[PDB]
Amino acid sequence: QQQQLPAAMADTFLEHLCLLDIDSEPVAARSTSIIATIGPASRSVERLKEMIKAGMNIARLNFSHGSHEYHAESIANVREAVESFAGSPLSYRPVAIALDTKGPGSGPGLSEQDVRDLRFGVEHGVDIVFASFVRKASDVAAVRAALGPEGHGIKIISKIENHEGVKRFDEILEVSDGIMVARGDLGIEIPAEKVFLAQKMMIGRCNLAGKPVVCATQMLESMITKPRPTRAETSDVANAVLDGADCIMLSGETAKGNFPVEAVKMQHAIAREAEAAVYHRQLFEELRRAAPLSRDPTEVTAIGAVEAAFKCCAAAIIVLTTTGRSAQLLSRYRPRAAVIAVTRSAQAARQVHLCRGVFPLLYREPPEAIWADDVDRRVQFGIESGKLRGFLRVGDLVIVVTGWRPGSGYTNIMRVLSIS
Amino acid sequence: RADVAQLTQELGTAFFQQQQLPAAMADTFLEHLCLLDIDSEPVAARSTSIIATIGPASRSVERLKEMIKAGMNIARLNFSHGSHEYHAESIANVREAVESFAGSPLSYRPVAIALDTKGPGSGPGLSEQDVRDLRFGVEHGVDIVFASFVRKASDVAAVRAALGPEGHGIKIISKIENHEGVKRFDEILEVSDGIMVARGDLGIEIPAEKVFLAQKMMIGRCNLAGKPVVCATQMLESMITKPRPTRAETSDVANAVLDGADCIMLSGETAKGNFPVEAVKMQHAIAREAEAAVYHRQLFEELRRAAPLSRDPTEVTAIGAVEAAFKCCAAAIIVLTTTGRSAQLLSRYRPRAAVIAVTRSAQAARQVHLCRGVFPLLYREPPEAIWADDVDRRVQFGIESGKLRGFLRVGDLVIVVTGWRPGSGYTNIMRVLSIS
Amino acid sequence: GTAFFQQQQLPAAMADTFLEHLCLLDIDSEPVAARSTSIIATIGPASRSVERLKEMIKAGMNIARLNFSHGSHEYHAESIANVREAVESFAGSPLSYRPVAIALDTKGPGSGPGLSEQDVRDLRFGVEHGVDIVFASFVRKASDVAAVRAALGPEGHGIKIISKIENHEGVKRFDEILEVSDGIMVARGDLGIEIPAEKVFLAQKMMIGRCNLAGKPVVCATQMLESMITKPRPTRAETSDVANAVLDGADCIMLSGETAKGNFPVEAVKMQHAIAREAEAAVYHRQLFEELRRAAPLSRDPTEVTAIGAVEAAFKCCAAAIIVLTTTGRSAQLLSRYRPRAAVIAVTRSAQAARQVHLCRGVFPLLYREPPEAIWADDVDRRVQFGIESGKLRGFLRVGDLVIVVTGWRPGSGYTNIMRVLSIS
Amino acid sequence: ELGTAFFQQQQLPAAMADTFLEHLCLLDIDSEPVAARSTSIIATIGPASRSVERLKEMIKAGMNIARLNFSHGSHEYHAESIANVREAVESFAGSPLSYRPVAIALDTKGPPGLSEQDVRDLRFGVEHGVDIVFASFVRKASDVAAVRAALGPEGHGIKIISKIENHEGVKRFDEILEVSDGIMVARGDLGIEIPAEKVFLAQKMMIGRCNLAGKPVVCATQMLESMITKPRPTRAETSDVANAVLDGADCIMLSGETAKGNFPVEAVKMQHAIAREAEAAVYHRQLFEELRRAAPLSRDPTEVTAIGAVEAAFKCCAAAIIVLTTTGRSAQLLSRYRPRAAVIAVTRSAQAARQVHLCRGVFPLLYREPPEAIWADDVDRRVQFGIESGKLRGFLRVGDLVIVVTGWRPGSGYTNIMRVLSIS
Numbered sequence A: 001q002q003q004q005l006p007a008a009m010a011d012t013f014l015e016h017l018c019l020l021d022i023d024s025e026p027v028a029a030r031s032t033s034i035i036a037t038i039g040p041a042s043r044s045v046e047r048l049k050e051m052i053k054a055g056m057n058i059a060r061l062n063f064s065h066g067s068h069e070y071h072a073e074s075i076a077n078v079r080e081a082v083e084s085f086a087g088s089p090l091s092y093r094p095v096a097i098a099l100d101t102k103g104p105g106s107g108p109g110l111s112e113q114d115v116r117d118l119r120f121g122v123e124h125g126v127d128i129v130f131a132s133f134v135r136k137a138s139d140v141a142a143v144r145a146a147l148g149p150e151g152h153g154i155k156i157i158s159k160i161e162n163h164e165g166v167k168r169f170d171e172i173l174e175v176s177d178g179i180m181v182a183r184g185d186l187g188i189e190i191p192a193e194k195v196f197l198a199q200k201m202m203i204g205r206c207n208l209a210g211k212p213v214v215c216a217t218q219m220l221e222s223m224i225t226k227p228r229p230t231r232a233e234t235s236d237v238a239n240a241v242l243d244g245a246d247c248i249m250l251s252g253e254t255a256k257g258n259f260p261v262e263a264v265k266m267q268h269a270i271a272r273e274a275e276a277a278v279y280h281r282q283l284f285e286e287l288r289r290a291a292p293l294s295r296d297p298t299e300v301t302a303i304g305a306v307e308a309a310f311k312c313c314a315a316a317i318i319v320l321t322t323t324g325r326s327a328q329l330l331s332r333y334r335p336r337a338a339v340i341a342v343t344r345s346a347q348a349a350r351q352v353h354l355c356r357g358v359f360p361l362l363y364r365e366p367p368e369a370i371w372a373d374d375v376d377r378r379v380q381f382g383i384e385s386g387k388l389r390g391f392l393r394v395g396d397l398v399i400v401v402t403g404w405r406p407g408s409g410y411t412n413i414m415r416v417l418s419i420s
Numbered sequence B: 001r002a003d004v005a006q007l008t009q010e011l012g013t014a015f016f017q018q019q020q021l022p023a024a025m026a027d028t029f030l031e032h033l034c035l036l037d038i039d040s041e042p043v044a045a046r047s048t049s050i051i052a053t054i055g056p057a058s059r060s061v062e063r064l065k066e067m068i069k070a071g072m073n074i075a076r077l078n079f080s081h082g083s084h085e086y087h088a089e090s091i092a093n094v095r096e097a098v099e100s101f102a103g104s105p106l107s108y109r110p111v112a113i114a115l116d117t118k119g120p121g122s123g124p125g126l127s128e129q130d131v132r133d134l135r136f137g138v139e140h141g142v143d144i145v146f147a148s149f150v151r152k153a154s155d156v157a158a159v160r161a162a163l164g165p166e167g168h169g170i171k172i173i174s175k176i177e178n179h180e181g182v183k184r185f186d187e188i189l190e191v192s193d194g195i196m197v198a199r200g201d202l203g204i205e206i207p208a209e210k211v212f213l214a215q216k217m218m219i220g221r222c223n224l225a226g227k228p229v230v231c232a233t234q235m236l237e238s239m240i241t242k243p244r245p246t247r248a249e250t251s252d253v254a255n256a257v258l259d260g261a262d263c264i265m266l267s268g269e270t271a272k273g274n275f276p277v278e279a280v281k282m283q284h285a286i287a288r289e290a291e292a293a294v295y296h297r298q299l300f301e302e303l304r305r306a307a308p309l310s311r312d313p314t315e316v317t318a319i320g321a322v323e324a325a326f327k328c329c330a331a332a333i334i335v336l337t338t339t340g341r342s343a344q345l346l347s348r349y350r351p352r353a354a355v356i357a358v359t360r361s362a363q364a365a366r367q368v369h370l371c372r373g374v375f376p377l378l379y380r381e382p383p384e385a386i387w388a389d390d391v392d393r394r395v396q397f398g399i400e401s402g403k404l405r406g407f408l409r410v411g412d413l414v415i416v417v418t419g420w421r422p423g424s425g426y427t428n429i430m431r432v433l434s435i436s
Numbered sequence C: 001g002t003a004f005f006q007q008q009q010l011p012a013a014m015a016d017t018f019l020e021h022l023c024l025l026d027i028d029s030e031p032v033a034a035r036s037t038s039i040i041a042t043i044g045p046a047s048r049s050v051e052r053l054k055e056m057i058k059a060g061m062n063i064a065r066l067n068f069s070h071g072s073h074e075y076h077a078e079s080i081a082n083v084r085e086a087v088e089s090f091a092g093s094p095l096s097y098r099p100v101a102i103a104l105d106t107k108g109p110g111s112g113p114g115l116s117e118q119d120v121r122d123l124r125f126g127v128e129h130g131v132d133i134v135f136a137s138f139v140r141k142a143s144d145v146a147a148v149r150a151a152l153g154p155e156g157h158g159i160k161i162i163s164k165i166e167n168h169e170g171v172k173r174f175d176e177i178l179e180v181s182d183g184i185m186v187a188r189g190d191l192g193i194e195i196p197a198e199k200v201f202l203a204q205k206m207m208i209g210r211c212n213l214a215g216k217p218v219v220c221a222t223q224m225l226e227s228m229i230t231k232p233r234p235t236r237a238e239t240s241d242v243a244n245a246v247l248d249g250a251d252c253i254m255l256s257g258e259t260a261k262g263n264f265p266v267e268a269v270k271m272q273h274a275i276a277r278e279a280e281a282a283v284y285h286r287q288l289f290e291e292l293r294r295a296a297p298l299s300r301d302p303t304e305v306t307a308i309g310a311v312e313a314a315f316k317c318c319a320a321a322i323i324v325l326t327t328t329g330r331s332a333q334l335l336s337r338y339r340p341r342a343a344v345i346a347v348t349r350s351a352q353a354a355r356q357v358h359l360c361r362g363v364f365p366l367l368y369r370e371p372p373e374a375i376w377a378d379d380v381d382r383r384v385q386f387g388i389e390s391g392k393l394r395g396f397l398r399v400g401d402l403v404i405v406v407t408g409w410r411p412g413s414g415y416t417n418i419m420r421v422l423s424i425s
Numbered sequence D: 001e002l003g004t005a006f007f008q009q010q011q012l013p014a015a016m017a018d019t020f021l022e023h024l025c026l027l028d029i030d031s032e033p034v035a036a037r038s039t040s041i042i043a044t045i046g047p048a049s050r051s052v053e054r055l056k057e058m059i060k061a062g063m064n065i066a067r068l069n070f071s072h073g074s075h076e077y078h079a080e081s082i083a084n085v086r087e088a089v090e091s092f093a094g095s096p097l098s099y100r101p102v103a104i105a106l107d108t109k110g111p112p113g114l115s116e117q118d119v120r121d122l123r124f125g126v127e128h129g130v131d132i133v134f135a136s137f138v139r140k141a142s143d144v145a146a147v148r149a150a151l152g153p154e155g156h157g158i159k160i161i162s163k164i165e166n167h168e169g170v171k172r173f174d175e176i177l178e179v180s181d182g183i184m185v186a187r188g189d190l191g192i193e194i195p196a197e198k199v200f201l202a203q204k205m206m207i208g209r210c211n212l213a214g215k216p217v218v219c220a221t222q223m224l225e226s227m228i229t230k231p232r233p234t235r236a237e238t239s240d241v242a243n244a245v246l247d248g249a250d251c252i253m254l255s256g257e258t259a260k261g262n263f264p265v266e267a268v269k270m271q272h273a274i275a276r277e278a279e280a281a282v283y284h285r286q287l288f289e290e291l292r293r294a295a296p297l298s299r300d301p302t303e304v305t306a307i308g309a310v311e312a313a314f315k316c317c318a319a320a321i322i323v324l325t326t327t328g329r330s331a332q333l334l335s336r337y338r339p340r341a342a343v344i345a346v347t348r349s350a351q352a353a354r355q356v357h358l359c360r361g362v363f364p365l366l367y368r369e370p371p372e373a374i375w376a377d378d379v380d381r382r383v384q385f386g387i388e389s390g391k392l393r394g395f396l397r398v399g400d401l402v403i404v405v406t407g408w409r410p411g412s413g414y415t416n417i418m419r420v421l422s423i424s
């Protein structure tokens, strides 16, 4: 059988590895998001359409290079390429826009250039900020203050790039929306042979906290000049997914290299293979054991839904979400079932790419008069887009996660539904 | 510590010191035993049902009201003794005692009536007296049959045929009392509604020192199958003449509950002894202590690992509801059921939360006592015009009756299990509700 | 062979979960291993005759308990003499000889707050008569154990003190009592009067678990086969209670009125023997060994390090036995704490140690009486060969079996450090 | 006692964790490695690494096995490389603290079956006393039998490590592993023969199966590729080396990095540094439990002694397991249980001393003293040699506990004793 199911049913991790089969083809949709840096090699609308088709989920703009005018044109081109697929509403793909700051460049403070760039991000409607060189909780507070009242909804992903950031990780993670393991600077700031320890520790802690973690830098470096990566590069991408990374990133590979589309395609192919090789039997038991007891109905519904999905091998968990939170709480238990998140918020649809296994569907259908009927069409929309995209078939079982009243914060219902 | 820290701040340290919760949170079975505390008081309602044999010592309506208050859930009538006239009078007295509390859902306690057959004797199958007694049971509306000396699947088919078309709803609990019944256990369990480990005859039919192996094997297999299992005979034997049991007797009751028995039984202790009410009270006290001492962490993990994957929505909803109940330390799981099946599927995962089963069927309310942790509520209100409103009213009836009986408190989290359409077989919804 | 893997609940032993282990238990899977839980039989009018004591030793009695709550010093001295006479009547066959420990159970503190003056006199009687163990009644705190130890004096340094936990205070102060005691007795008679009867099983399971964790002997006592005082067969609750005490992890099981004053002393011993053998094969060693290993702290004591290596090696090859040379019994006790399925055959020259190792589950003491060889390595080998010959004669071993041999690098107690895999020829 | 500082080093807080997730969360960049590097480094000796002076630097950097790629050069070229390796190794024979045996491995050019050139190159290997053969493109058990037969009458002791480089080799892995001494995951050809994105699955599967079988597994090709031209590797390269060790590889290899690159010594130093870090990060608690649960019961005293010795080593945090071995088999059976303690293998065989580099955590000590007339005295002398080398090299201190594994009689195949010794 397909998707490494013989290896998935093994009684030990050792037997799981022994049962991995190169002929067991992946069937599930790719769960780990790809962040591609948009630069000289990947700026055109035509090239961006090819990168979206190849698998890009988040477009990163490196504010260490270019200018505000340059990045504004890149943002416009990304939006134009994304909207060129709006003619097919059940299959259109949202793409988040992330702003990566230049950093403090000396001074444990928020550069005035960073204040100006963060203000640019708010004015241009960016979804995420990758905050460079975060070394303490007060650095995150400074970024949040610089985003102002209009940028309240922007996610702050703190980049850990030095010894201080690693040592003060817990306080940084507590106030951040997520973390980026920025291996480039980290490998210069700490001994290169210790970076893998920092990566594995940060991924584990983010998985424990249920917060997004991005693995970044030199993942497919040789692809800047060559059409195929080295054996160490494919292994690095696969191991980042197996470590538990929610996102994988391409920097020079897409910003300035000769094969930007090929680099995205390679990350897509490796992530799909690595996701099927995840040993869910141990992973779910450990996530379940480590996750604290909770009296929050969204949290309680999420664990019940993921348990139910594993019991019936559910093809998907369809969840209605306003902010993306209910989808994030499902994602933290790493279900094998795809989490199809139906949302009316375009920003939440883009941001939800930070959470592994969450497939955002932006709902743009006319409302139903009775709230209960409106909820049911959003569920049938998740099922129709699910069927159109290959996630679901007639006869499949799905878990549907909804709330008892409109507005964010009221998820409390899990339903077992048979498709068609 | 960090996996229970926010909930310890919210519910308090006193909450986590009661009902053997420190022992329940242990990482190993050895650590679990080391953390058992005689000062950790049981809080939950007793979930293992007590079957009491009704005979000369426990027959009067006044005495039966005392036994219902002490905790009796199932009244057993041993057709190896008395007559049809004697047993019919016992049944009438049980029903009169049960109906004396029928004025309210707060006081009403359904009590199942079980008929224990005389058995095949030296014969190879269903005896003529058993056919007559089984017909008597159908005519008197008994809920359960404890079929004596079941040795093969064809013995339970013979009992089913002798109950006729009008006894289709009666549960057949096969009594395993000899070597053949133990060896053919799987085929017997497949066609039975449940099993009774009849240790009296078993201890004579096989070496006495092997009975505990048969008991533990049968309890384990019934737990795996999700079918009721009764532990029976000599549990509190000395209480036939003495007001207090021996140390081996209290240990035996506790170990039957820890083994996974859904029901515990009293035979001579209630049928002919000097302290029938005290024997019920003692079983009640021991079962509540033993239930809190169950190592749910390993038990739930093992029930999850052993149970095969399922495409039955009732089964899928039941495991999701039990997982949700454990996550928030839910006080109860309120389930709507017509036949008791949805409550049985919740019960097989052994939640620590009480399963409050709301049903319109009086027979299902009596029979669910066979499933550990199921508290039946008989709903007697007439149906609402809108089906969704009728469902909501039954859920609210469960909550109100739960609150008025101490099962629920304001601020508690309750898991509610319902279906998407009327009729049996459509349970598929789990809701997390905060009690206000 | 397939027959080997069908006996001693081996299908249930190989199960991946405790639930599947229970589902696989088979009443037709016969026990093969020797009974490892010791039987303490209380001595009284029904079991004092030398001829009756010979029958009780053959039935399986390992420890003779003298209850100082009854009788005079002259009575108990006569009990001791009869036990020793019955035990020594089998000394003519050194390969089959079974040592029997003598335990003195004290009267207790009564209304007083500590060690009574009668207990001081009885403890000194025990030292003078060479008793092996003291079952100290109503131990409520660590200072009660220190008072017993002081009353035994310098000549009773080798006597084991097993503290009886019989009330709420003893249960609450269990950790401090276990720390200074050699072991514990769950005295359920008094405990069931001192605390609610329905809570005794929790105290029993907690104390057995903690003793197992500490590697110290634990005795389950009182009313185990009570009905056998007057009836020839026990109730279903009684056989279940004995089996569950062994499954809980008790090192010893006890008979009080059943052997002291009942009509069936020999049969009560035989019944406990039969149940214990069945219950020992039903122990789920896969989880048990894993949990004992995980819970046991790291150690820099060579005897402790050799013991875990020897138990792990025994499980790897399904060793029939672990033969250990011991002066004080300590090396055998450290093997016993890991609950090997292999019998621990303890070869010793110390008659007191041979009697005392009965407190440890799975330890079969062999008293070696030959005078020391001039060459120490040859003396060690002769003792190992004596263990093998006794093992073969008693049915523990056969030619072709693998055995683990545990010895030390120099004479005297405290130097066990060697483990060897040996093929029986 | 050991002190709080002891329990903060070598990822001991992460090692004591109750779950793999907690283990990852407890990894600390400030927890320094203390144990000697246990994963062997195979360095390909070519134009960039051939001189005696350069070879001395590579031995000091950590090279344990010298690989000679018979796809390049000639017999005369490789014979000179072998001579230079032996000369560099013997330049440290005067000092017991620096003397390290180095195995010599011959990597064949490759094939329908065994090629004519491979028969001649295998014959060259036997004549030159090579220790290991890395057999290229092994696709079935009969390929291993052909190599074994070509190793003439004088070369049956040479270890055959089968290189799995294509779909057929992956599919017929079990039959190949059964007749091979070990496996090499030859990722270069494998990444061309099968889709590049599936190579990590083949690597993890082969490493797992070799670990289960107790046979050496080598991770090879492009581990530090960028170091062919640059002095420092990429983030993917350090991650790849660490993950190969964490996967369970016994050996890690350098090809172009040492054969033709600008930084051969630096590439060896980098693999040394990463492997030491990755070895301390191994989650032994789950690993040992799983190796124990998966390994079948055994009536072989060497195998029974080995598991008892590894269990005893974990119980006391033993600094080393000193084992007397003539063929290296007793050290290999200790190595399969992945002890945290170094396995110091004391042997009179120079060949076995070179070959045990294939087994993770085995530190060979060649013993050349003349035999004692009393066998028990000869064993004691060898045990003390391992303790004294261990004190000299920093493995041991007075007061440490060591596990000693010996047999009851001379000759190979009788290991059955495990002793706990206090270092005095």
Ligand SMILES: O=C1c2ccccc2C(=O)c2c1cc(S(=O)(=O)O)c(O)c2O
Pocket: A037, A038, A039, A040, A062, A065, A066, A067, A070, A250, A251, A252, A253, A255, A256
């Ligand atoms: O965005 C840019 C860019 C924008 C405008 C002019 C030039 C560049 C450029 O040269 C560049 C960029 C990004 C990266 S990065 O994302 O890979 O870090 C680079 O390495 C890099 O060199």
Ligand SMILES: O=C1c2ccccc2C(=O)c2c1cc(S(=O)(=O)O)c(O)c2O
Pocket: B053, B054, B055, B056, B077, B078, B081, B082, B083, B086, B266, B267, B268, B269, B271, B272
């Ligand atoms: O039901 C009866 C009964 C009915 C009518 C007259 C007399 C008896 C009677 O004497 C009796 C009964 C049950 C048991 S039971 O506990 O074994 O089931 C007895 O042991 C027992 O003695």
Ligand SMILES: O=C1c2ccccc2C(=O)c2c1cc(S(=O)(=O)O)c(O)c2O
Pocket: D044, D045, D046, D047, D069, D072, D073, D074, D077, D255, D256, D259, D260
């Ligand atoms: O040029 C050589 C060479 C030349 C002369 C003697 C020996 C080698 C040699 O050993 C080598 C070489 C090239 C490669 S490559 O071209 O395949 O990358 C190797 O891998 C490799 O090992």
Ligand SMILES: O=P(O)(O)OC[C@H]1O[C@](O)(COP(=O)(O)O)[C@@H](O)[C@@H]1O
Pocket: A320, A321, A322, A323, A324, A325, A326, A327, A401, A402, A403, A404, A405, A406, A407, A408, A409, A410, A411
């Ligand atoms: O995941 P979030 O942000 O909490 O949103 C979940 C919310 O979505 C719903 O399912 C539907 O709400 P809306 O009708 O407002 O879209 C709510 O019942 C629930 O509270």
Ligand SMILES: O=P(O)(O)OC[C@H]1O[C@](O)(COP(=O)(O)O)[C@@H](O)[C@@H]1O
Pocket: B336, B337, B338, B339, B340, B341, B342, B343, B391, B417, B418, B419, B420, B421, B422, B423, B424, B425, B426, B427
């Ligand atoms: O447990 P059972 O016997 O399957 O009954 C559960 C049934 O009860 C309900 O919750 C309510 O059904 P009714 O309205 O027929 O009483 C159904 O939706 C569900 O199928």
Ligand SMILES: O=P(O)(O)OC[C@H]1O[C@](O)(COP(=O)(O)O)[C@@H](O)[C@@H]1O
Pocket: C303, C325, C326, C327, C328, C329, C330, C331, C332, C379, C406, C407, C408, C409, C410, C411, C412, C413, C414, C415, C416
């Ligand atoms: O278990 P103990 O009391 O520590 O005794 C074990 C001792 O027995 C021996 O194996 C043999 O000692 P003896 O020759 O003194 O009997 C010692 O090497 C070892 O120290």
Ligand SMILES: O=P(O)(O)OC[C@H]1O[C@](O)(COP(=O)(O)O)[C@@H](O)[C@@H]1O
Pocket: D324, D325, D326, D327, D328, D329, D330, D331, D378, D379, D405, D406, D407, D408, D409, D410, D411, D412, D413, D414, D415
């Ligand atoms: O690992 P190998 O090849 O089996 O060698 C182990 C052998 O070494 C010894 O420990 C010592 O043997 P020698 O004295 O012959 O070297 C033997 O007793 C044992 O059989």
Ligand SMILES: O=C([O-])C(=O)[O-]
Pocket: A132, A159, A161, A181, A182, A183, A184, A185, A186, A216, A217
């Ligand atoms: O900024 C980054 O992404 C880095 O340093 O790796």
Ligand SMILES: O=C([O-])C(=O)[O-]
Pocket: B148, B175, B177, B197, B198, B199, B200, B201, B202, B232, B233
């Ligand atoms: O029939 C019974 O109930 C018995 O034998 O125990």
Ligand SMILES: O=C([O-])C(=O)[O-]
Pocket: C164, C166, C186, C187, C188, C189, C190, C191, C221, C222
């Ligand atoms: O003293 C005892 O043995 C008791 O109270 O059980």
Ligand SMILES: O=C([O-])C(=O)[O-]
Pocket: D136, D163, D165, D185, D186, D187, D188, D189, D190, D220, D221
């Ligand atoms: O031969 C090799 O080592 C390869 O192909 O990677």
Ligand SMILES: [K+]
Pocket: A062, A063, A064, A100, A101, A102, A103, A132
């Ligand atoms: K930047």
Ligand SMILES: [K+]
Pocket: B078, B079, B080, B116, B117, B118, B119, B148
């Ligand atoms: K009957």
Ligand SMILES: [K+]
Pocket: C067, C068, C069, C105, C106, C107, C108, C137
């Ligand atoms: K006494």
Ligand SMILES: [K+]
Pocket: D069, D070, D071, D107, D108, D109, D110, D136
């Ligand atoms: K080659």
Ligand SMILES: [Mg+2]
Pocket: A132, A133, A161, A182, A184, A185
């Ligand atoms: Mg940076």
